[model samples]
Target: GAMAWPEESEKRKRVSSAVQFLHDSRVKITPAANKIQFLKSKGLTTEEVCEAFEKAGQTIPLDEIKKIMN
Candidate 1:
């Protein structure tokens, strides 16, 4: 998807860098696979997390509702 997401070399490079950081960042943006990693580390509730996610919606939210529901 990253390959399809960005067509330009410079853009692709930037995207790659961002993805790397997003993966490692403590601020947790994507659908975190580890729920303990999500709740314990981030210190947030479903409402707070969902609302934070809603705030992030303007930039296109990566829906974790299914993950959260599970």
Candidate 2:
């Protein structure tokens, strides 16, 4: 059986990739729903997307993400 564990290194890479993508492409979109949806379209999980924003020195408002997600 193949092991199916989540990789920490992969998570780190995703975080870095996500932040860079936001930096290069996002360019200050205002809608929380649209932003979250766009990130998700790029294969980023919600938590990873949030961490990416923080890593880029711009933390996302959890309430908005929650409103979009839930």
Candidate 3:
């Protein structure tokens, strides 16, 4: 069964400021580029990627995309 409209609408509210920041910056790593670069140079794991996202409070689960596409 499909999710109710209100359930889907609630998901939209969860969009984070981090996502907006990344989008607005064209994903160029403006504010956090140096840190991200440093981490990458150290050969960190994918958790590092999530850390950066979390640090910016913009981390969205991959599954959230379906809701967004709707």
Best model per TM-score: 2
Q: What are the clash counts of all predictions, listed in order?
A: 0, 0, 0
Compared to the true structure, candidate 2 yields what TM-score? 0.67
Off by over 4 Å in 3: 1-24, 28-42, 62-70
Please give the RMSD to the true structure for each candidate, in Å. 12.2, 4.5, 12.0
Tens digit per residue, CA lDDT, model 3, 1-70: 3688896554333323333444555554454544344434544434434444665666645344223322
- Model 1 C-alpha lDDT per residue in residues 23-68, reported as the tens digit of each score: 4556454455453245434444344444443443323233554454
Residue 26 alpha-carbon offset, candidate 2, angstroms: 5.4
- lDDT of model 3 at residue 33? 46
lDDT of 2: 0.72
Ranking of models by lDDT? 2, 3, 1
Backbone clashes in model 3: 0
